[PDB]
Design a protein around this ligand. Structure first.
Ligand code: CLA
Ligand code: CLA
Ligand code: CLA
Ligand code: CLA
Ligand code: CLA
Ligand code: CLA
Ligand code: CLA
Ligand code: CLA
Ligand SMILES: CC(/C=C/C=C(C)/C=C/[C@@]12O[C@]1(C)C[C@@H](O)CC2(C)C)=C\C=C\C=C(C)\C=C\C=C(C)\C=C\[C@@]12O[C@]1(C)C[C@@H](O)CC2(C)C
Ligand SMILES: CC(/C=C/C=C(C)/C=C/[C@@]12O[C@]1(C)C[C@@H](O)CC2(C)C)=C\C=C\C=C(C)\C=C\C=C(C)\C=C\[C@@]12O[C@]1(C)C[C@@H](O)CC2(C)C
Lengths: 164, 210, 194, 41, 215
């Protein structure tokens, strides 16, 4: 109960929706022989379904009046009430990989600018240079702040403009 | 790397163990003493571990020798690994504090002669007594040689000291490992190995303990 | 010089030989620069002065039998009625706290930021000892010696009361009573195992 | 086959190998770790 | 030059004379993290302080751990010594951490300013005569002065020996703490208890008999 909400292990619409999905799977299962190949896949779907409900109720997700889990996207209401794995932990688990790709592509461009003709190594990617920059880009925030402290991250007004 | 006596007669020797250090035979297969600034420290450390181990073996065997012969001591028959539990005129904390102050004097006096030789041969309070100049670290002389030795044939005496000392260091490691496995007196281990020398090797005690 | 503090060791270049209390003892090179040495030669003497007064006050209470140095500022909690030579003092905590904050600052700030003097001749020698002719450095050496011993004594007071909870005389009597069971090792603090 | 490896290093071939790699990594993850809505432990 | 892999091309920024004369250089940077020389200068400080705090922490784990399993101490587990010793405590943890962050931040910001400019804290008038011994040595990361009381730096021989002994014991202690955390997570016992469990049955009680090397 952060903003009119309720834990999903407490709310009854969540359990009613679990029983609704298991009821649809059960009346779907009632047509087949108990050991046939469709019935095995239907019971495996039931097992994945029940494991999904158990692990959404276990992590302390907040349900609403609809019986559906919600995501508190504010630190200080996620850190204080234990919901940092909703948004606040994957908002850095994403940005590590985002700045990773943005650093690997940056360094692949800068390490191919100073050649004979760079464009041929942009349609035909130099794979050993690409995999070297793929592995050694693991510490990208480190190298990014060390590049920002120089001023070698930005370029000055050598850039191309029109008519200011 | 000469005609020196060797631990393995025939093999090569690394050369920095020529014979200037007392009682050397080229035994350093791990090549520890390559830097001579480590080798001087290791020579003093072998002297100190050796002299304390010679005192250790003389203070473990001789009380057990006179216990198995039998005198009337307040401590007689008590194990050397059980003499700490034995009570005295003072509890062991005061014993340890007096020890760690007297040796705090003596060891720093010895270390100042290690880092500058010939510079600790004068008393603090009686500034007329001195050790004679020209001594090496590890061998102060003077009052530490009151019986007039080391005035001729000193290399053979240093070799005797280091051989008895290496033997006594092996003996004290034997006292540890041979009181930790069978849990008896190290002289009552010699008693059993002289009772039936074949029916108690280390291997049969190991296999009976296994 | 007059002393070497560890014989055979060399004296540092940044300690003057005419300076009182000199032994060469600076293993940290902590007064290497001359401005820092000039600040510390003034502050060591003042620590020695206030520690000699502190050890005289901490010993005279027990030699006159009025508790110890520790429980003498213990009237401010759980009652009151401070004493001095048995004479009562009708002062609460805040009044004497403000008087110590004010009346000492009028002498401390008058001493300190009016120069850097540490032996002021004149009114502070009423009998007349330091005419700075021949017996200046000898009396300064005795003052430094006695003050260093007093600083060691007060740090011993602090550690002794933190380890045994007794006074100076109250455990000097125990060290004279049981000399081998009433030292710094039989407590379970200073020596951790044995 | 040096020319074949330069063909393998062109833009659409690297694109269709790397996207199958990053597809069949996330697909094996969602097989062995079903339904990750929230960062659990 | 005694590399971490004998057949590898060592990265060229670990073969400069600035980096070959550095403590514990075994040519190990397979991810290129120190390619800028001032990045390497910063990370050398980070390695020294991550390794000195780890040596202090791992000593404070396994010296009382080995002195608990052998008797004559009753120090608890390192993952239990925060639960206990807050009852036997004059303060709660929040005030204690606040005093900790003030006393440690005053140190760490002086170290920050000395790394960003060497000899910064030695300028006169900073402290009350104490600042004169705060220039450090000619190289950063090894201050000395008040931090060398026994005086092991006044040699200029065997000094790289002391550097490399510090760096190797420190890297081993950093691996030991990452150990302590992981061997706590894997089996829930203590580190000396895990050492005894390995030494009583090595070929069956290890990290292949739990759920962390899972196929
Ligand atoms: C409000 C009154 C007042 C004022 C204005 C001063 C002002 C001064 N005193 Mg003074 N003093 C006072 C009261 C006062 N004192 C009282 C009441 C006493 C007796 C207790 C003293 C005892 C005293 C001594 C003994 C000395 C001074 C010194 C000084 C001067 C140095 C200024 C300084 O560094 O500040 C000091 C500011 C502080 C915040 C002090 C910090 C706390 C100290 C270090 C005690 C902590 C001890 C601790 C256990 C050691 C550190 C930890 C260690 C174990 C690692 C300055 C002129 C010194 C001097 O003249 O130097 C040349 C000097 O040697 N005074
Ligand atoms: C931007 C919008 C957005 C967002 C935020 C999400 C978010 C999510 N979707 Mg969704 N989705 C979207 C758009 C979006 N989607 C769209 C447009 C579609 C239609 C195509 C879908 C269709 C869809 C389906 C069908 C499913 C999801 C699922 C999920 C969940 C992800 C679970 C997962 O795969 O974990 C991935 C977790 C990771 C930790 C992956 C990280 C990769 C590794 C571990 C890191 C690298 C390690 C190592 C270094 C790699 C080795 C490198 C190699 C070279 C050696 C998450 C709640 C799944 C779910 O469970 O729903 C809740 C699911 O089944 N979505
Ligand atoms: C769009 C900006 C924004 C807004 C409107 C709010 C709104 C709020 N924050 Mg919040 N917050 C934000 C960004 C924002 N936050 C960011 C970027 C951080 C840092 C990561 C925080 C850290 C934070 C903390 C630590 C706390 C709040 C709290 C609060 C509440 C007062 C309110 C719901 C407080 C709360 O829980 O409500 C009383 C509280 O303690 N916030
Ligand atoms: C080295 C070394 C060390 C550390 C010890 C340590 C010990 N010896 Mg020992 N000992 C040694 C060498 C050593 N010994 C040698 C070389 C001989 C021969 C002996 C002969 C010996 C006997 C016969 C006894 C001990 C005893 C003891 C224990 C108590 C010491 C005691 O009563 O105070 C000694 C106090 C003194 C004041 C003597 C110092 C002054 C001497 C006379 C100067 C010469 C203690 C574990 C006693 C023991 O274990 O019984 C329980 C005991 O009875 N020792
Ligand atoms: C040469 C150094 C040396 C060695 C090898 C030992 C070895 C031993 N001591 Mg010992 N001890 C030493 C110096 C030494 N001590 C010193 C310097 C003191 C202070 C005077 C003590 C005081 C002491 C006490 C009080 C006790 C031991 C005990 C022990 C035994 C078990 C303790 C342990 O785990 O180890 C063990 C054989 C214990 C013992 O004998 O019980 C088995 C015991 O109670 N020791
Ligand atoms: C000074 C060296 C020395 C001597 C004379 C002894 C003597 C003895 N040990 Mg012993 N021991 C020693 C060192 C020594 N040990 C060391 C260093 C350790 C630690 C590894 C042990 C560990 C040990 C155990 C665990 C056991 C013995 C046992 C024995 C006894 C039976 C012999 C046996 O089974 O072979 C044991 C022989 C060895 C372990 C090899 C010793 C290697 C030495 C250093 C080389 C030989 C020295 C020299 C060339 C000749 C020695 C004679 C000379 C000094 C007069 C016997 C009294 C057993 C016992 O008590 O049963 C009665 C037993 O179970 N010893
Ligand atoms: C805080 C009090 C204090 C201060 C400021 C000094 C200051 C000084 N002493 Mg001194 N000293 C003191 C207490 C003090 N001492 C005590 C208590 C003793 C007896 C143990 C001595 C014994 C002594 C000798 C024997 C000699 C000096 C010398 C010196 C001078 C040069 C060394 C230096 O740079 O020290 C600077 C010192 C400090 C800045 C104090 C730092 C204190 C640290 C932070 C904590 C110390 C912890 C401590 C060990 C345990 C608590 C300098 C004037 C030498 C000299 O020429 O005399 C004038 C000399 O040879 N001192
Ligand atoms: C660095 C570091 C690390 C890795 C840990 C790690 C841990 N602390 Mg901890 N702690 C730290 C610093 C650290 N602490 C600091 C600086 C303080 C002082 C405020 C504390 C105070 C503290 C308390 C008071 C407690 C922990 C507890 C815990 C454990 C539960 C998670 C875990 C082993 C808890 C614990 O051990 O209970 C099982 C606990 O109650 N810590
Ligand atoms: C110990 C001490 C200083 C110790 C510092 C030392 C050794 C530093 C040595 C070094 O720096 C050098 C020299 C050289 C460096 O290279 C190396 C080291 C080794 C680092 C100061 C004590 C200094 C101690 C002082 C000044 C004590 C004063 C005490 C007073 C005023 C007490 C008053 C009271 O006791 C009464 C009177 C009555 C009670 O009822 C009330 C109270 C208040 C308790
Ligand atoms: C600091 C540290 C631990 C310090 C521990 C402390 C203070 C513990 C204190 C306590 O225990 C006590 C005392 C008592 C307990 O009751 C309480 C706590 C509080 C628990 C560990 C560091 C641990 C640090 C570790 C393990 C770091 C490992 C980093 C590695 C291996 C990186 C390698 C690379 O980066 C390079 C070198 C080059 C790249 O190209 C390639 C890669 C591979 C990326």
């Amino acid at each position: 109960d952060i903003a009119g909400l309720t834990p999903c292990s407490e709310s009854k619409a969540y359990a009613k929706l679990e029983k609704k999905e298991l009821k649809t799977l059960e009346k779907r299962l009632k047509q087949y022989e108990a050991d046939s190949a469709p019935a095995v896949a239907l019971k495996a779907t039931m097992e994945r379904t029940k494991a999904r409900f158990a692990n959404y109720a276990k992590a302390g997700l907040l349900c609403g009046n609809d019986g559906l889990p919600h995501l508190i996207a504010d630190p200080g209401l996620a850190l204080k009430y234990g919901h940092a794995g909703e948004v606040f932990i994957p908002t850095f688990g994403f940005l590590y990989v985002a700045g990773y790709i943005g650093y690997v592509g940056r360094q692949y461009l800068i390490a191919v600018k100073g050649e004979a003709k760079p464009t041929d190594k942009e349609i035909i990617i130099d794979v050993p240079l690409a995999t070297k920059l793929a592995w050694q880009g693991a510490g990208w925030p480190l190298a990014a702040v060390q590049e920002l402290q120089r001023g070698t991250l930005l370029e000055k007004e050598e850039n191309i403009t029109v008519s200011p | 790397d000469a005609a020196l006596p060797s631990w393995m007669p025939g093999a090569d020797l690394p050369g920095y163990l020529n014979g200037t250090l007392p009682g050397d035979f080229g035994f350093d297969p791990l090549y520890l003493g390559q830097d001579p600034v480590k080798l001087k420290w290791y020579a003093q450390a072998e002297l100190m571990n050796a002299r304390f181990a010679m005192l250790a073996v003389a203070g473990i065997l001789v009380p057990e020798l006179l216990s198995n012969i039998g005198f009337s001591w307040p401590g007689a028959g008590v194990a050397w690994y059980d003499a700490g539990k034995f009570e005295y005129f003072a509890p062991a904390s005061s014993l340890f504090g007096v020890q760690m102050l007297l040796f705090a004097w003596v060891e720093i006096r010895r270390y100042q002669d290690f880092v500058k030789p010939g510079s600790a041969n004068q008393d603090p309070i009686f500034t007329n007594n001195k050790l004679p100049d020209g001594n090496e670290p590890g061998y102060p002389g003077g009052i530490f040689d009151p019986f007039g030795w080391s005035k001729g044939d000193i290399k053979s005496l240093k070799l005797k000291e280091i051989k008895n000392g290496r033997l006594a260091m092996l003996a004290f490691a034997g006292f540890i490992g041979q009181a930790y496995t069978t849990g008896t007196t190290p002289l009552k281990n010699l008693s059993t190995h002289l009772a039936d020398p074949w029916s108690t090797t280390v291997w049969q005690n190991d296999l009976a303990r296994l | 010089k007059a002393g070497n503090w560890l014989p055979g060791s060399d004296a540092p270049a940044w300690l003057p030989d005419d300076l009182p209390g000199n032994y060469g003892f600076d293993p940290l090179s902590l007064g290497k620069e001359p401005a820092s040495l000039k600040r510390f030669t003034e502050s060591e003497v003042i620590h020695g002065r206030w520690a000699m007064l502190g050890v005289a006050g901490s010993l005279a209470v027990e030699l006159l039998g009025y508790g110890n140095w520790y429980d003498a500022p213990l009237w401010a909690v759980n009652g009151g009625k401070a004493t001095w030579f048995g004479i009562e003092v009708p002062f609460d905590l805040n009044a004497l706290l403000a008087f110590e904050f004010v009346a000492m600052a009028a002498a401390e700030g008058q001493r300190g930021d009016a120069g850097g003097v540490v032996y002021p001749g004149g009114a502070f020698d009423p009998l007349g000892f330091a005419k700075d002719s021949s017996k200046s450095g000898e009396l300064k050496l005795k003052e430094i010696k006695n003050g260093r011993l007093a600083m060691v004594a007060f740090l011993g007071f602090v550690a002794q009361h933190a380890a045994t909870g007794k006074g100076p005389i109250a455990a000097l009597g125990e060290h004279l009573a049981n000399p081998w069971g009433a030292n710094f090792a039989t407590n379970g603090i200073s020596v951790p195992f044995f | 086959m040096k020319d074949f490896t330069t063909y393998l290093s062109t833009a659409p071939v690297i694109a269709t190998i790397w996207f199958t790699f990053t597809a069949g990594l996330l697909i094996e993850i969602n097989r062995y770790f079903p339904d990750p809505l929230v960062f659990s432990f | 030059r005694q590399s971490w892999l004998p057949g590898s091309q060592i990265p060229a920024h670990l073969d400069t004379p600035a980096a070959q004369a550095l403590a514990g250089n075994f040519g190990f940077d397979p991810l290129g993290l120190g390619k800028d020389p001032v990045a390497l200068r910063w990370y050398q400080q980070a390695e020294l302080i991550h390794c000195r705090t780890a040596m202090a922490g791992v000593a404070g784990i396994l010296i009382p751990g080995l002195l608990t399993k052998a008797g004559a101490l009753n120090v608890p587990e390192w993952y239990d010594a925060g639960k206990v010793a807050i009852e036997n405590s004059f303060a709660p943890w929040g005030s204690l951490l606040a005093v900790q962050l003030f006393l440690c931040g005053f140190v760490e910001a002086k170290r920050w300013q000395d790394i960003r400019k060497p000899g910064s804290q030695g300028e006169p008038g900073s402290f009350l005569g104490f600042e004169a011994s705060l220039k450090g040595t000619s190289e950063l990361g090894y201050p000395g002065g008040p931090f060398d009381p026994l005086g092991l730096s006044k040699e200029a021989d065997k000094w790289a020996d002391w550097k490399l002994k510090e760096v190797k014991n420190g890297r081993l202690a950093m691996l030991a703490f990452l150990g302590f955390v992981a061997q706590k997570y894997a089996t829930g016992a203590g580190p000396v208890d895990n050492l005894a469990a390995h030494l009583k049955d090595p070929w069956h009680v290890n990290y292949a008999t739990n759920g962390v090397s899972l196929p």
